[PDB]
């Protein structure tokens, strides 16, 4: 506090020391389970390690990566920074500014981009033109590789959404793993490892089904580290903007009335947004289109199948109309 000198009142405001706390927990149980009959084990399986155990461990490893990706992608981001595909760098300078304004430390920062974001970076004329970027040995042109921008090295992952990028500090996300113990009653099990995480392995024969059941598991927990006020500042998400959508294949004709065709929608960046679109049919009697993009034309005629995609920047939905001739 501060007070005026020679102030006739000599009261001083008491400063107060308030510690805070949060909590971290184990929450999930990641497992791969297999069951074999005695016939399969005797005749079908020829190498148990290569045929059963290694695919099992690889499956658990990919499941753990998906767990981490759900943590990173699902973290509370109060805003998303919109990358302009023609001018991608200002979005990343914005992300750096958002992190610094929150007094996040400049070291131990990780930037992970999706395939679409990496391609957008290489396609940007800032990196592709060798006079806007320096870089006479042009790498975004001869190698389709950007590597570093805005003070952060680019990591590429196919485990996250292609049009999403995340920049986080080391303290942003916490992971925890526990290895379950093999109980007294269980047949002595093995122990494996996925991404450096120890997994419990266990096998139990069921006389009822004349087979063996194997389980490969681990206990997991994850935390997003927010602030004292509950805000999340230690990580930033960026999303690639979309200005239009197209239905691939153009106008098409169904083989029969009973026939079905699955539509695919790509934005102007080339990202697949079919799972994020809403589909309508102008002539529902002639053709019906599912919520997942599947078109079925029950009656012969001509219909207009329309896909509407609300872009990452919000606003009016982009529309793409195609025509179907049902025979």
């Amino acid at each position: 506090n501060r007070r005026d000198l020679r102030d006739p009142d000599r009261t001083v405001i008491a400063s107060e020391l308030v510690e805070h706390s949060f909590g971290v927990t184990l929450d999930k149980h990641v497992y791969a389970a297999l069951k074999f009959t005695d016939e399969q084990r005797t005749l079908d399986i020829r190498d148990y390690t290569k045929q059963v155990l290694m695919p099992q461990v690889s499956a658990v490893a990919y499941e753990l990566e998906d767990y981490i990706a759900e943590l990173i992608e699902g973290a509370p981001y109060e805003e998303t920074i919109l990358i302009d595909p023609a001018d991608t760098v200002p979005a990343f300078i914005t992300a750096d500014q958002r992190m610094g304004e929150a007094n996040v430390p400049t070291d131990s920062r990780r930037l992970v981009v999706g395939s679409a974001v990496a391609a957008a970076l290489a396609k940007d004329k800032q990196f592709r033109h060798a006079d806007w970027s320096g870089d006479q040995a042009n790498a975004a042109l001869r190698e389709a590789h950007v590597g570093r921008l805005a003070g952060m090295n680019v990591i590429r992952s196919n485990a996250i959404a292609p049009d999403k990028a995340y920049l986080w500090h080391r303290t942003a996300f916490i992971l925890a793993y526990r290895t379950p113990v093999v109980p007294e009653g269980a047949k002595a099990g093995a122990s494996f490892s996925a991404n450096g995480v120890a997994l419990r392995w266990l096998a139990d024969y069921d006389y009822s089904q004349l087979g063996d059941r194997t389980l490969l598991d681990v206990f997991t927990g994850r935390k997003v580290v927010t602030e004292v006020d509950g805000s999340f500042v230690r990580a930033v998400e960026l999303q690639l903007q979309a200005s239009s959508i197209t239905i691939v294949g153009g106008a098409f004709a169904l083989a029969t009335t009973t026939g079905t065709k699955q539509l695919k929608v790509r934005d102007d960046n080339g990202t697949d947004v079919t799972a994020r679109c809403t589909f309508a049919s102008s002539a529902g009697t002639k053709a019906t289109v599912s919520a997942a993009g599947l078109v079925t034309g029950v009656a012969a005629g001509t219909a207009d199948i329309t896909a509407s995609y609300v872009p990452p920047q919000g606003g009016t939905a982009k529309t793409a109309t195609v025509t179907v001739t049902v025979p």
Binding site: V18, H20, D27, E73, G74, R222
Partner: protein, 48 residues
């Protein structure tokens, strides 16, 4: 109860849920993006 009975509710699970520190996230596949869950916005506890 009985050994063969279905597994009952864990008191540790009930307390863990009532403490409210299990991490809720967004579906990562829902379009448009979900609203941030309330647990994801809770302030740090003043005590412990």
């Amino acid at each position: 109860g009985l050994i063969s009975d279905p597994v009952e509710v864990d008191p540790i699970q009930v307390g863990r849920d009532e403490a409210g520190w299990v991490q809720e996230l967004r579906d990562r596949e829902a379009w448009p993006k979900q609203e941030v869950p309330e647990q994801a916005k809770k302030p740090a506890k003043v005590g412990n």
